[PDB]
Design a binder for this molecule. Sequence first.
Ligand code: HEM
Ligand code: HEM
Ligand SMILES: N=C(Nc1ccc(CCNCc2cccc(NC(=N)c3nccs3)c2)cc1)c1nccs1
Ligand SMILES: N=C(Nc1ccc(CCNCc2cccc(NC(=N)c3nccs3)c2)cc1)c1nccs1
Ligand SMILES: C[C@H](O)[C@H](O)[C@H]1CNc2nc(N)[nH]c(=O)c2N1
Ligand SMILES: C[C@H](O)[C@H](O)[C@H]1CNc2nc(N)[nH]c(=O)c2N1
Ligand SMILES: [Ca+2]
Ligand SMILES: [Ca+2]
Ligand SMILES: [Cl-]
Ligand SMILES: [Cl-]
Ligand SMILES: [Gd]
Ligand SMILES: [Gd]
Ligand SMILES: [Zn+2]
Lengths: 403, 403
Amino acid sequence: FPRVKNWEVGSITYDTLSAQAQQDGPCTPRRCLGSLVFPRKAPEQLLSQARDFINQYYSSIKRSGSQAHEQRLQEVEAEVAATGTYQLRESELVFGAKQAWRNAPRCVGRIQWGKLQVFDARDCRSAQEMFTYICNHIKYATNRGNLRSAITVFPQRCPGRGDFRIWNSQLVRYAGYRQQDGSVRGDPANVEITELCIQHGWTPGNGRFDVLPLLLQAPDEPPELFLLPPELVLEVPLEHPTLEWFAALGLRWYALPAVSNMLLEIGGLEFPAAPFSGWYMSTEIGTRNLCDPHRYNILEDVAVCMDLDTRTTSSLWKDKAAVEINVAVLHSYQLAKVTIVDHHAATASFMKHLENEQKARGGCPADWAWIVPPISGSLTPVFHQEMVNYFLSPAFRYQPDPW
Amino acid sequence: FPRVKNWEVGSITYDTLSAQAQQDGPCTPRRCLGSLVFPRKAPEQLLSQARDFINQYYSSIKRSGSQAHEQRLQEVEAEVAATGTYQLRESELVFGAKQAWRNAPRCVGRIQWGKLQVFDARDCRSAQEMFTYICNHIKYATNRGNLRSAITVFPQRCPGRGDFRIWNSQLVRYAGYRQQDGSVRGDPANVEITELCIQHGWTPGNGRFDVLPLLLQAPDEPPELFLLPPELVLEVPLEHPTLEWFAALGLRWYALPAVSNMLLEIGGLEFPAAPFSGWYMSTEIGTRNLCDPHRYNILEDVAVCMDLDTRTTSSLWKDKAAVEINVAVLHSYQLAKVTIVDHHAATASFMKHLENEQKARGGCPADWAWIVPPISGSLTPVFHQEMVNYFLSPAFRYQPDPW
Ligand code: HEM
Ligand code: HEM
Ligand SMILES: N=C(Nc1ccc(CCNCc2cccc(NC(=N)c3nccs3)c2)cc1)c1nccs1
Ligand SMILES: N=C(Nc1ccc(CCNCc2cccc(NC(=N)c3nccs3)c2)cc1)c1nccs1
Ligand SMILES: C[C@H](O)[C@H](O)[C@H]1CNc2nc(N)[nH]c(=O)c2N1
Ligand SMILES: C[C@H](O)[C@H](O)[C@H]1CNc2nc(N)[nH]c(=O)c2N1
Ligand SMILES: [Ca+2]
Ligand SMILES: [Ca+2]
Ligand SMILES: [Cl-]
Ligand SMILES: [Cl-]
Ligand SMILES: [Gd]
Ligand SMILES: [Gd]
Ligand SMILES: [Zn+2]
């Protein structure tokens, strides 16, 4: 098993959990592809994954080898024999979603993994009911700014019927209007979904923070457009505690990060629509979403406004402006009473998570490049922590866009 | 051939050079160990490495397979048959030193790889001569602050003979002293080598920045304790352009990063003593050396002096203090006319190096976790650049401590 060192403390662990990694990553002894954004790209195989999952379930409740464990294994085996697939028990779906979060190598927020509200929407039958489920998710999770982690699980993939899909990458996203100059007004990460919304009859705005409609896909159905009720979309105007002109930038962000395009895989079953939400780490907004050159790209405007020497790199004008933007985000969310965590607190809690998981399971799949925050990397403890990246199931997986 | 994307620009390249990776890294399809600091830990073997290097060499000078190529190959064959090793020609040594730097996946400064002064010390004998070679290295490389990359190559390992070894990890290091107060005065990274110099007759100081003596090891002799003439060790007292109290913290650092504990491998030959130097990237000093919790750990000291609110993480007092420490580093080296590069300029140049290397040989081994700076990660272009990590030879490799 790989030896894993913390270089801040000298402490040494061994990741015995990685030996159990089923699905393969992109690395080989010849070359490491750890930095790649996309690393990854029927009866007996399903049973192997199902059996393994049921084993995980009954371990988590300290009833391994029990009568109930054996009977449930036999029950899954019989259903897979009769139908080629099976249904999770409610309890299993809840456990499976929590495990999928727990297994997500790129999530720094996994200290929370046991605190997850699971909405079972597996009886959903239309895009309209999907919209209702989504609105209930948003209302619950937002909780008027006291954010609560939740996942809504729509029906699993099954042969002979199309998937449920939420086309939007997140439930709340700002329009990106591909301006004609090749530029973008709004969020450039959302130019494609924005144009698909327009294609499907949405009347666009012209702002930088226009909330997109939902394109909800029921099985074998073109996507259907649904407008989120404004009262359900909590937003935070950005201001800075000491730079009063900052508020005149007219920047905003939304309260609720609710990822809606990943596939949830539990015991070999696949849920292509299972949006999940937590709360933001402030660097996601302050550093990536606002300061990435290919996103809102506000770094230079702020630095110029702060009167920084932007003609020379060595003045660290980029670093100084980014810090103040991150300050504005944290200050603004706290002022709005919307849950948010800074990258220092998040990474400190992740270190506690790693320690819990070493005790609980003998390791923790972690993607160092994604866990270390995009600013102040070595100022956080995770920078100094060696990490082992591997794929466990249940899992949140990337999947092709449905168009 | 791995596809490699830049996510800021969307451009795609294919790393065809990774296919030539000679050694095996720690990663497998089951688990990625790319974040590990220590990834790595007979005549037919030596010959096959020697041959491949000679082929590399003659290919790079467009003497592909010519008459000289065939004669050099036969020379090394007879040498190894006669002696068990062989001797590099001076130009092969220069070529091999440059390629070992060029191949170093964790070096962000490789845009400079074609410019390296190679001091051939292979005739060295006795630690006394080592010291002279090292002093001439330090003097040449420092160049009154106009730093110039240089390597001094001491005699290679060979059968039955000892090794030349520089016990110090760098030619310039500050001492670290412990107490039954528990803490360390000076650099905690150098506590081991500091007690060794003391155990070898050096009488210690009591300062935070006591430059260490050199512990040089001729083959099969005890290490000999040499003192660097203080006018050879150019240092930069650290001050801040606007925070006038920063100078009163008494911080300083040295001009010349000269790494003296890595092993240089060329053509199956191993040079355990081959110190190389360049110049610093500012984050190495201002972020890692001064702000790492297990190094000088000054961040809270600086934040207190900046009157920052250190009781909550969300004030980003750590980020603001780090930025000003990096400012002080850049300002102090520039005012002292000592070569230094900030992390924005260095990562921008590494992007240019990536493009040059894509053209030169179809790719470039790069370790994302080490190329991305330890502050302002995503504010630099390398953050958004997927990278392939692999081991090429000639190479610089870690090696066990002599003791
Ligand atoms: C409770 C507070 C949470 C915080 C602060 C948090 C934080 C984060 C952050 C900062 C990322 C990286 C996102 C990016 O850079 O694009 C991430 C990734 C991720 N999070 Fe969490 N998270 C939280 C809750 C959750 C929940 C409730 C789930 C699912 C039930 C989840 C699942 C994931 C997954 C699967 C990823 C990886 C996404 C990818 O690979 O692209 N997280 N998390
Ligand atoms: C000329 C200016 C140079 C700059 C600005 C530079 C910058 C850097 C930096 C910032 C690192 C990371 C080191 C750390 O974080 O501890 C590094 C690593 C490295 N550099 Fe460069 N470097 C330069 C020249 C050179 C030269 C001349 C050589 C050898 C001839 C070299 C060989 C290496 C190697 C082997 C590593 C990897 C060290 C390791 O794996 O531990 N570099 N460089
Ligand atoms: N898809 C593309 N790129 C692309 C690929 C991957 C990603 C990953 C972005 N994850 C969003 C995300 C994920 C996880 C967490 C957050 N935040 C949060 N705190 C939370 N949410 C939910 C619970 S916590 C946010 C983003 C973009 C393509 N672009 C062009 C052609 S393909
Ligand atoms: N040695 C230990 N860890 C350890 C392992 C690896 C490293 C890598 C750092 N190499 C120093 C270094 C290397 C390369 C570049 C720099 N900077 C520079 N700009 C230059 N130099 C020379 C030319 S450019 C500095 C550091 C520490 C251990 N600690 C405890 C038990 S083992
Ligand atoms: C190329 C690189 O993998 C890519 O830019 C990654 C790096 N680390 C990241 N880390 C997080 N949390 N989110 C990201 O989008 C990225 N992007
Ligand atoms: C654990 C982790 O690999 C380790 O802290 C690495 C991360 N990236 C780094 N990057 C650089 N340039 N130098 C380092 O020492 C490290 N340390
Ligand atoms: Ca049933
Ligand atoms: Ca005592
Ligand atoms: Cl986001
Ligand atoms: Cl250093
Ligand atoms: Gd003000
Ligand atoms: Gd004061
Ligand atoms: Zn890897």
